[model samples]
Target: QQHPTIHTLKIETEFFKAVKERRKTFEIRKNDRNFQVGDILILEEYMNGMYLDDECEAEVIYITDYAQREGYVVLGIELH
Candidate 1:
């Protein structure tokens, strides 16, 4: 799969640390293609912390798709 445009963004430190340490939950908009099951996404920590330029890549493991609600679509991504 070829995505016309691929945008990489850093996840905020406050949010990132919270998610990493406490396992905080964050929700992505349904309309945005930021997340998908089995998709590997890059996560960058925000500035103003010890790990400012830290970046981690993670794969989407689970996707909750329910009828009448936003559903997850499997993106068969092909790397070049």
Candidate 2:
């Protein structure tokens, strides 16, 4: 497998919490990062108009566009 590319981005607090708590396991975003399976995502929590000191890493497991809006991709992830 290729070495995973690391992408650091802001995540809203609600979504971040969900992922960290294992209540959710996917991300939907505009496919602007050239996201690919096996990529690593560093999600920093943003709330109250600022980035909080909370973050988590996730590995992309699957990607799809089914029923998604134009230019968006849904990423199935595994948190680390």
Candidate 3:
């Protein structure tokens, strides 16, 4: 594939919630790419209280998309 859009997420989300607790719980759409270790992801965040928007880049250090449901894939990534 050529270019896929970054996954922009709201701050009060699973991504931020998990990461705030010293973990990163990831999620990919059923028809999305299977993220791999060492992959860099450009993430944009939207907050409700602090900054309205934020952006950062992170690398994937772990991967596991398990027990996927019909509409979603759940995972966790360790990043640096």
Candidate 4:
């Protein structure tokens, strides 16, 4: 792809923290964005039904839906 598509998504506090700390390296979600390698995922921190100002972005390095619940996919990410 010439340019990676950026996907903004809401993320829970715990997961957001983990991602920020680089402890969590993958994202699982419904395959609604036609996600692909090289895509950019911007995770917006969300909690208590509200979205926090905090956010982070990661590059999609790998993607797969195999053995995952139908319509869902997992993305291997690297913080950017």
Question: Cα RMSD (Å) per model?
Answer: 6.8, 0.9, 4.8, 0.9
Candidate 2: C-alpha RMSD after superposition: 0.9
TM per prediction: 0.50, 0.95, 0.48, 0.95
lDDT of 3 by residue, 1-80 (tens): 43433444445444655664566555454536655555556555556555445455555555554676664554344433
- Poorest 10 consecutive residues of model 2 by lDDT? 1-10
For model 2, what is the alpha-carbon lDDT of residue 78? Answer: 99
Candidate 3: how many backbone clashes?
0
Whole-model lDDT, candidate 4?
0.94
Off by over 4 Å in 3: 1-14, 17-31, 47-51
lDDT of 4 by residue, 1-80 (tens): 36889999999999999999999999999998899899999999999999989999999999988899989999999997
Count of clashes, each model = 0, 0, 0, 0
lDDT of 2 at 33: 88
**Over 4 Å off, model 1:** 1-7, 25-27, 48-51, 65-80
Tens-place lDDT per residue, model 2, 33-67, is 89999999999999988999999999999999999
Relative to the unseen true structure, what is the C-alpha lDDT of residue 80 in candidate 3, on a scale of 0 to 100?
Answer: 39
Alpha-carbon deviation at 37 in model 2, angstroms: 0.3
Each candidate's lDDT (Cα)? 0.52, 0.95, 0.52, 0.94
Weakest ten-residue segment in model 4 by summed lDDT:
1-10
